[PDB]
Write a protein that binds this ligand. Structure first.
Ligand code: NDP
Ligand code: NDP
Ligand code: TRH
Ligand code: TRH
Ligand code: MG
Lengths: 298, 298
């Protein structure tokens, strides 16, 4: 059976190249796909390739995910995160194909404490989340044989993330400043991709699991304590990390163009029972990518 | 459900840490496991931890795999590859636990051309293969709720392999010399680990798949052409690879302590239909680890 993949060079995407490889026959494409259209800024183009290949399963790891830039260029985010997905969905539903699609917790507003659920109310603080929410609604309404994975604080060892950018700073710098109020759960590309593969195989054999799932690594943490642990691991790996004065903060002290949510604690209890899958503590995943990075010899 | 893993720091093993993480609750251990015995040179010790944790599933990625060294130190290979496995199996069967275990094509003799099957005859040319064959027979006879994965030419991006050692040479050297007669299929840790995860989930729900499976990447190739492609990829990634004169060879021109088989073409048609899984062409897997290696910035 035929799997079709977009956004193959991204974090998740690069990992789905590995994870989907045995699940079924894999065509993997990106923006720069030359013999085949993987360009999300052309909804009809990506719609044409879905129609053109007739995939059994479609994994969409392509997107517009430049959150702050999206506020400045929103109509483009709409094209990528709503319009192309909408088109992709409507195409998929003609061939009866499963559409797998990634979404975000930025769908939710802040308002902290209790962790967010799949049947909870949606009020996007920012554009990224408003646009992406449209995409998941658009998919929801054009193709019910869909799988939507709302995730958060996504990192991978190959591709830009918080731990990547945070570490670069820490090696260069003596004294550093970052957020301690934003509660949430860092989630690996590896986990996303591995669970995706297992989820697909369940869905094929049980269409009932079609729907919306909150899929994020276990537990919760702050961007601060996220970064602290990142440093301990750098430290642990003997690296002379320039940092001698680590400084915590509450959000609003430092500006960002888009409004970030304060309560990014997603509840995944649905995914676990539905797919019979485990979702381990966020740290483990993080230490794993860091170990691989700190193995620095060619 | 509880998964138990040995040889977690090896090629396959490190990848199983990732792949098993969502399949079930994961205890991962090695030789140097301190609060828990992951030392295969003590069969009773590793037997004690199986009994001690009572795992639902046991993945054994630990082994003695130093093939030439094994000829010199065979009684030790027996301890690791036969004795400990035997013990592990017999323990597992008391708790009714699935034993997952990796084996080799070195189980087979040379005698080329036609690709090797699961119900074909076994005549190990070398010790490694003779010892490992004992282990898989020992497991076969103490624990029928087992999964045996005979693989070959196993590489990974973290841990020593042919492509790793071949490349080191090529960057250092002008003129280089390697084998073109040994036919076989390079197989990633990633693939091994990903398929293992899917296989476990099938086995739980269908005990009938218990048995012996040839699990190796698709197609076939020579160690020479393996290495050539490795260089093209190094070259392709702009690397000034010292190599100006690449030299092919037929086996016997260069000595090795152990006898290597000439026909390492494994047939995997059984695995594919039994697990409903795909086993893609060997190149893809290889290019993937190489791309990740040639992404050289921290
Ligand atoms: N990163 C995170 O923390 C989060 C991600 N997600 C979702 O998970 C999925 C994957 O995330 P992740 O892998 O982290 O994000 P990445 O940015 O790493 O991947 C998104 C992909 O979209 C590609 N892309 C950009 N513009 C276009 C375009 N016009 N046409 C086609 N592709 C394009 C990007 O490539 P490039 O820009 O390099 O050309 C990239 O390959 C997406 O749906 C995303 O919204 C959800 C919440 C969290
Ligand atoms: N590499 C290949 O091409 C092949 C591998 N296989 C099988 O696949 C499985 C994994 O292979 P692979 O991951 O490639 O091999 P690795 O050598 O990378 O892994 C084997 C593991 O065994 C560990 N080990 C060595 N001595 C002991 C000991 N006394 N007690 C416990 N662990 C020990 C090794 O660690 P360390 O030595 O670093 O301490 C290592 O973690 C094994 O069953 C192997 O036989 C089969 C055929 C092909
Ligand atoms: C500029 C700056 C940022 N930061 C921190 C604040 C932010 O809350 C934190 C997170 O940074 P980024 O992950 O780069 O922002 P981002 O918008 O890319 O993050 C989000 O991307 C979406 C695609 C996801 O749905 C989210 O789950 C999340 O990953 O970086 C500082 O601590 N100090 C600073 O000076
Ligand atoms: C010394 C030397 C080796 N080589 C090549 C010859 C060998 O056939 C080739 C393979 O090397 P290695 O993989 O290091 O040998 P090895 O014994 O570790 O290889 C085997 O390990 C077992 C664990 C597996 O079951 C096998 O499938 C295979 O991976 O290296 C040369 O080409 N030129 C040389 O001068
Ligand atoms: Mg990896």
């Amino acid at each position: 059976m035929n799997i079709l993949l977009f956004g193959k060079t991204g974090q998740v995407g690069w990992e789905l190249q590995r994870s989907l490889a045995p699940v079924g026959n894999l065509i993997a494409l990106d923006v720069h796909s030359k013999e085949f259209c993987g360009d999300f800024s052309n909804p009809k183009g990506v719609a044409e390739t879905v129609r053109k290949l007739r995939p059994d399963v479609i994994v969409n790891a392509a997107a517009h995910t430049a959150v702050d830039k999206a506020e400045s260029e929103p109509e483009l985010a709409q094209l990528l995160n709503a319009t192309s997905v909408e088109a992709i969905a409507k195409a998929a539903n003609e061939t009866g194909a499963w559409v797998v699609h990634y979404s975000t917790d930025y769908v939710f507003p802040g308002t902290g404490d209790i962790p967010w659920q799949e049947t909870d109310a949606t009020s996007p603080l920012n554009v990224y989340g408003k646009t992406k929410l449209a995409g998941e609604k658009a998919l929801q309404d054009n193709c019910p044989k869909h799988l939507i994975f709302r995730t958060s604080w996504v990192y991978a060892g190959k591709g830009n993330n918080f731990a990547k950018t945070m570490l670069r700073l820490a090696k260069e710098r003596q004294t550093l400043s970052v957020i301690n109020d934003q509660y949430g759960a860092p989630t690996g590309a590896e986990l996303l991709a591995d669970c995706t593969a297992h989820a697909i195989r369940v869905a094929l054999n049980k269409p009932e699991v079609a729907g919306l799932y909150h899929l994020v690594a276990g537990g919760t943490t702050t961007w601060h304590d996220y970064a602290a642990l990142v440093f301990d691991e750098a430290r642990k790996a003997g690296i002379t990390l320039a940092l001698t004065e680590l400084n915590a903060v509450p959000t609003s002290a430092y500006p960002t163009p888009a409004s970030r949510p304060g309560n990014s604690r997603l509840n995944t209890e649905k995914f676990q029972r539905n797919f019979d899958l485990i979702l381990p503590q966020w740290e483990l995943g993080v230490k794993r990518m860091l170990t691989e990075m700190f193995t620095t010899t060619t």
